[PDB]
Amino acid sequence: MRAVNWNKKEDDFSLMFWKQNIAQFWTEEEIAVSSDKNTWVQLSKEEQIAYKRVLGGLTLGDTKQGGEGMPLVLVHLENLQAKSVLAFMGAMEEVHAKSYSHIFTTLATEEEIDEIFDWVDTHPLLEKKAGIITSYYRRLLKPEVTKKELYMAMVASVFLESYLFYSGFFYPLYLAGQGKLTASGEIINLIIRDESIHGVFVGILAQQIFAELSAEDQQEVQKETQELLMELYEIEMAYTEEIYTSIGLVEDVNRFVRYNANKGLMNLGLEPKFEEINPIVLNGL
Amino acid sequence: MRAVNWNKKEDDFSLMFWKQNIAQFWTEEEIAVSSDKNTWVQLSKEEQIAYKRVLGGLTLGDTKQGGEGMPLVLVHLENLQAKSVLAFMGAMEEVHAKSYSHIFTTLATEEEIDEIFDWVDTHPLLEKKAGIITSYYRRLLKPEVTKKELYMAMVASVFLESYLFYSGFFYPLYLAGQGKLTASGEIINLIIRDESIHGVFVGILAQQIFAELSAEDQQEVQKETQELLMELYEIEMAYTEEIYTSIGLVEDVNRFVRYNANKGLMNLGLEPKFEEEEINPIVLNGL
Numbered sequence A: 001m002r003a004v005n006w007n008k009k010e011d012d013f014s015l016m017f018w019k020q021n022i023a024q025f026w027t028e029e030e031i032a033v034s035s036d037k038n039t040w041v042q043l044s045k046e047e048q049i050a051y052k053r054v055l056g057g058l059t060l061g062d063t064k065q066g067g068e069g070m071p072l073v074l075v076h077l078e079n080l081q082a083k084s085v086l087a088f089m090g091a092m093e094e095v096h097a098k099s100y101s102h103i104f105t106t107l108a109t110e111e112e113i114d115e116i117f118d119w120v121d122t123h124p125l126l127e128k129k130a131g132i133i134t135s136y137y138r139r140l141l142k143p144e145v146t147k148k149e150l151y152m153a154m155v156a157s158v159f160l161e162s163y164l165f166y167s168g169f170f171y172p173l174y175l176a177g178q179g180k181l182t183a184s185g186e187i188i189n190l191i192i193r194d195e196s197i198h199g200v201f202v203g204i205l206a207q208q209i210f211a212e213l214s215a216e217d218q219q220e221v222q223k224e225t226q227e228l229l230m231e232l233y234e235i236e237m238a239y240t241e242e243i244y245t246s247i248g249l250v251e252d253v254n255r256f257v258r259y260n261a262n263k264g265l266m267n268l269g270l271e272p273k274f275e276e277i278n279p280i281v282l283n284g285l
Numbered sequence B: 001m002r003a004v005n006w007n008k009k010e011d012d013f014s015l016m017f018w019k020q021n022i023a024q025f026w027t028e029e030e031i032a033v034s035s036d037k038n039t040w041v042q043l044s045k046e047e048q049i050a051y052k053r054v055l056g057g058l059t060l061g062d063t064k065q066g067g068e069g070m071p072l073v074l075v076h077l078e079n080l081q082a083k084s085v086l087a088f089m090g091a092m093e094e095v096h097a098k099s100y101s102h103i104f105t106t107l108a109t110e111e112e113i114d115e116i117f118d119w120v121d122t123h124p125l126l127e128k129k130a131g132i133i134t135s136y137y138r139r140l141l142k143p144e145v146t147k148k149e150l151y152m153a154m155v156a157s158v159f160l161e162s163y164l165f166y167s168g169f170f171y172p173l174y175l176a177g178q179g180k181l182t183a184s185g186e187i188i189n190l191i192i193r194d195e196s197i198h199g200v201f202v203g204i205l206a207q208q209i210f211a212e213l214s215a216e217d218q219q220e221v222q223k224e225t226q227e228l229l230m231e232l233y234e235i236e237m238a239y240t241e242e243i244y245t246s247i248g249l250v251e252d253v254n255r256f257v258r259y260n261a262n263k264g265l266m267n268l269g270l271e272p273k274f275e276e277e278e279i280n281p282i283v284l285n286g287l
């Protein structure tokens, strides 16, 4: 039975991503959030509700990535150095999720926080979203999995990290780019800096598995990938309408979703499927 | 579908274990090992071989805890705050495994390192040891596991972290306690500081699962736990005989194993089963 030997490369990229993930390490206590109170109170009820709802959605994403996606992808990898990177990423997913609670503690009361997490748990669209993603992970709860199933779990992971999350990062970046909630915005940037290299690395692993598949299996997962992409897109369009109508940003957010879906596709080595970033969001980055 | 909410406690201990794990975070770049070359050459061939073999075994343990053990236990936990802690511990298992490679790069040539890992991979007793433990994790590869299966996987994890590893930490500690390989010894101590709180935490979770089981299931896993304990112990005594006969430490290591088995049992809330020794005083100096 093999132990991980870092003095013999198993691939050309794992050491680089290991070092980078380590270099980027951070935790919530680093960023103080209290000074955001001064711009929080200037927002409207509907804006505050939107912000709280998108942050609850982001927490759910990271909860599922740290507690389901990374563990079940990594346990079936044969490459022990890549496993190590994915284990570290999974731990950072939990740092992300905890950092949203740190923001909430400054911006909401205990009763309001419970209202957020109750709303997250019962929201039909969030349930549908996460349910579709996690169903690819649940296929991996058996002793022998096919490479098609592992490929598609990696596709689902890239789509969550690089794509389905970003309907949620839009609003924190949009406010930070206007100089509102900028401390919370520095936390979201740290998170994004992690998610970016997460999606890149899982996408590299996906392309390596893909190249081992037979031609018939390649055609089957390409079809499933394109379908999943547009299935999630449909649901996200419904989610964005529900969250952002009240504050006039539905069509901006949808443009941000399409941009990030294209990024996700490219992390997988695939061509873009939708035809620039909102300039205020760009300033928040 | 629930998201983790750290502003409402799911239990009394996960927050403090989260904070402690973060506080203790470290990586291999933080300890330079080159200065160990001076005492490395003072060792015999047989002592050097022993040291490389036990670090090979340690690397294997951490490889399996990070890549199988923590992931498959945490995926089935319902407590989301406890899941967060196990995920962070799993990542630290990978830092541990990499830190052994950092030691090897200084102490062994490229071909000597290959020999270590080939020896690790083909060793009958290490395969039997690791195979018994990972067979409890493999049971968790299905959509719905029972709490007996989950409990027994947690027992296996505590036995690996708190007990079956220490046949291996003995020799780095013993040599550090004699002034040899002390920078590698600082690394081993960092690892041990992690492993201690890992075993405590998983043991708390085990105890909580145990109290949820039916009486009939409790009786079943209580007996399996004691059988597993003594099955592993028999294998570990064969392992220690094979590793340590050449350097005359077999019975010293066995005392250390029994001491750490008792600690594992206490992490699980069980009474000790081996006679109470003092830790070897040279090992104690290495700590």
Ligand SMILES: [Fe+2]
Binding pocket: A065, A089, A093, A161, A194, A195, A198, A199
């Ligand atoms: Fe991520």
Ligand SMILES: [Fe+2]
Binding pocket: B065, B093, B161, B194, B195, B198, B199
């Ligand atoms: Fe451990």
Ligand SMILES: [Mn+2]
Binding pocket: A061, A062, A065, A093, A096, A161, A195
């Ligand atoms: Mn994430």
